Paper text:
Biophysical data for 38 structurally diverse pseudocyclic designs produced in Escherichia coli are consistent with the design models, and the three crystal structures we were able to obtain are very close to the designed structures. The large set of pseudocycles with central binding pockets described here combines the diversity of native protein scaffolds with the stability and robustness of de novo-designed proteins, and our RIF docking and Rosetta design calculations suggest that the designed pseudocycles provide better starting scaffolds for small-molecule binder design than do either native structures or previously designed de novo NTF2s.
a–e, Crystal structures of the five-repeat design E8 (a), two-repeat design H12 (b), and the three-repeat design H10 (c–e) are shown as gray cartoons; the loop, sheets, and helix of the design are shown in dark blue, magenta, and teal, respectively. Central pockets in the designs are shown as gray spheres (a–c). The electron density map of the interface and the center hydrogen bond network and water are shown as gray mesh. The approach generates a wide variety of structures strongly encoded by their amino acid sequences (as evaluated with RF and AF2, and further indicated by the close agreement between the crystal structures and design models), with between 2 and 7 repeat units (N), repeat lengths of 15 to 78 (L), and all ɑ-, ɑ/β-, and all β-folds.
Residue numbers in the entry: 1 to 127
Write the structure that this text describes.
């Protein structure tokens, strides 16, 4: 598999191991303010990755968002991953709304604004 961490500069870090990826994301967030992690998700699923590097899969985005809030507090980190098409980037905010981009730095900039507004936002990238 391939797991991708995105930081606040729009840099992409690739990993073969989820626990190492989730640990990098948690560190970039604590040290530099922002990080998302994208993981392979089955079609019609959504996945939340927590601060322990564990996945939580869902078919209902509203339930995923609810869980992502429990996990960010309990484990120190949470990121929602959704399937994206090549050359697209999707931002999911803390209320479950999806915003589509074709420029990663644009997607990151929006995610930062939505994190301020709603408390939480993730950026999903193609795997």
């Amino acid at each position: 598999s391939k797991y991708v961490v995105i930081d606040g500069e729009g840099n992409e870090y690739e990993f073969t191991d989820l626990k190492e990826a989730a640990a990098k994301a948690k560190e970039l967030k604590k040290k530099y303010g922002f990080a998302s992690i994208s993981v392979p998700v089955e079609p019609d699923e959504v996945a939340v990755v927590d601060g322990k590097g564990n996945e939580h899969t869902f078919t209902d985005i509203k339930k995923a968002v609810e869980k992502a809030k429990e996990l960010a507090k309990e484990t120190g980190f949470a990121s929602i991953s959704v399937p994206v098409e090549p050359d697209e980037y999707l931002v999911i905010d803390g209320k479950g709304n999806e915003h589509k981009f074709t420029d990663l730095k644009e997607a990151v900039a929006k995610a930062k604004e939505l994190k301020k507004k709603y408390g939480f936002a993730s950026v999903s990238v193609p795997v």
